[PDB]
């Protein structure tokens, strides 16, 4: 079995064209990326307090 990664054909009606134009002119995906980065700032960091804390090890 195989899968196609980039074989979509954009819709050509007025509504889809206007959605794409609004994305182009109003920067929707850029604001979406900003929103993703904003979420990360508010969550707990992964940093441990070396040398007072040590990374996990095994026998």
């Amino acid at each position: 079995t195989y899968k196609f990664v980039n074989m979509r054909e954009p819709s050509m009606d007025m509504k889809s064209v206007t959605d794409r134009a609004a994305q182009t002119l109003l920067w929707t995906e850029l604001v979406r990326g900003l929103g993703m980065t904003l979420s990360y700032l508010f969550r707990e960091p992964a940093t441990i307090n070396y040398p007072f804390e040590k990374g996990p090890l095994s026998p």
Binding site: W27, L30, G33, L34, T37, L38, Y40, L41, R43, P45, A46, T47
Partner: protein, 303 residues
């Protein structure tokens, strides 16, 4: 007591520039699921001091063959212009009350490219000169649209006086009157200060760095004054100062956020961005903002 006022304008700007480096590190780290410097000082608060002392006690490297004159001249001009761009700003009272304050700021920003040109020329290498020429081209390209956007916005103000921007926005911000101009202004100030996604390029290095940062903070404060008009009480200016500082901080943090959110352009891509997307729209919106006050009979007072 004018000298004391000049000093109280100069020194805190440099201190805020020093601590902006720390914020830039902390904010980027926390957006990257880590922390910024938290060891040097109680909260990394002494990290800028350690950086400054380390930078000033390192060996400096002269080219030994380049023009030492322009080599020392460039950082002087950069830092002097960076500090000079602060005198007309009303927060809420300017240090110097200029009639044409906005034009003066535009002129200083235009002068700011001589430092890039002279550093590239005094580098005594072909590759550094190529980089300098690329940076100069980007800077001039984007200051074109900065000027056009700025006068198109000022057409609602009535003059070039920065103090009248407070009066124009007494009831509503200018962001609501013209947001597209604000978006292009924000992106053009990002490209003007060579900040990501437009960053294609010991002692004098620190001097240049301070100037770049001072320019970032000043540009964000100018943006806040232009488009986010704080309400000013003539009997309590501290309220205006607090509002203006908070908005400036928000915009600077947004600059860091953008640096942490996106890849960077190619040189041709940002050149095309300006010349083929911002300039046509900027011209169209300049025509619109020329026509609108006449159309709606809403011409500002001063002449």
């Amino acid at each position: 007591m004018f000298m004391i006022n000049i000093l109280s304008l100069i020194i805190p700007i440099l201190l805020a520039v020093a601590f902006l480096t720390l914020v830039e590190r902390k904010v980027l780290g926390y957006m990257q699921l880590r922390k910024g410097p938290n060891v040097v000082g109680p909260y990394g608060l002494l990290q800028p001091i350690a950086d400054a002392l380390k930078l000033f006690t390192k060996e400096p490297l002269r080219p030994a063959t380049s023009s030492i004159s322009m080599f020392i001249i460039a950082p002087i001009l950069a830092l002097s212009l960076a500090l000079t761009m602060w005198v007309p700003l009303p927060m809420p009272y300017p240090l110097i009350n200029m009639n044409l304050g906005v034009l003066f700021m535009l002129a200083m920003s235009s002068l700011a490219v001589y430092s890039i040109l002279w550093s590239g020329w005094a580098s005594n290498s072909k590759y550094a000169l190529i980089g300098a020429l690329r940076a100069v081209a980007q800077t001039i390209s984007y200051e074109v649209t900065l000027a056009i956007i700025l006068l198109s916005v000022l057409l609602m103000n009535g003059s070039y006086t920065l103090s009248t921007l407070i009066t124009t926005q007494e009831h509503i911000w200018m962001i609501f009157t013209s947001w597209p101009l604000a978006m292009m202004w924000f992106i053009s100030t990002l490209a003007e200060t060579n900040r990501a996604p437009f960053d294609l390029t010991a002692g004098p290095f620190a001097m240049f760095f301070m100037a770049e940062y001072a320019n970032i903070i000043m540009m964000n404060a100018f943006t806040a004054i232009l488009f986010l008009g704080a309400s000013h009480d003539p009997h309590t200016p501290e309220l205006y100062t607090i509002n203006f500082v908070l908005k400036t901080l928000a915009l600077t943090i947004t600059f860091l956020w953008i640096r942490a959110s996106y890849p960077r352009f190619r040189y041709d891509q940002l050149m095309h961005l300006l010349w083929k997307s911002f300039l046509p729209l900027t011209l169209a919106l300049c025509m619109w903002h020329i026509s609108l006050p006449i159309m709606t009979a809403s011409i500002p007072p001063q002449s």
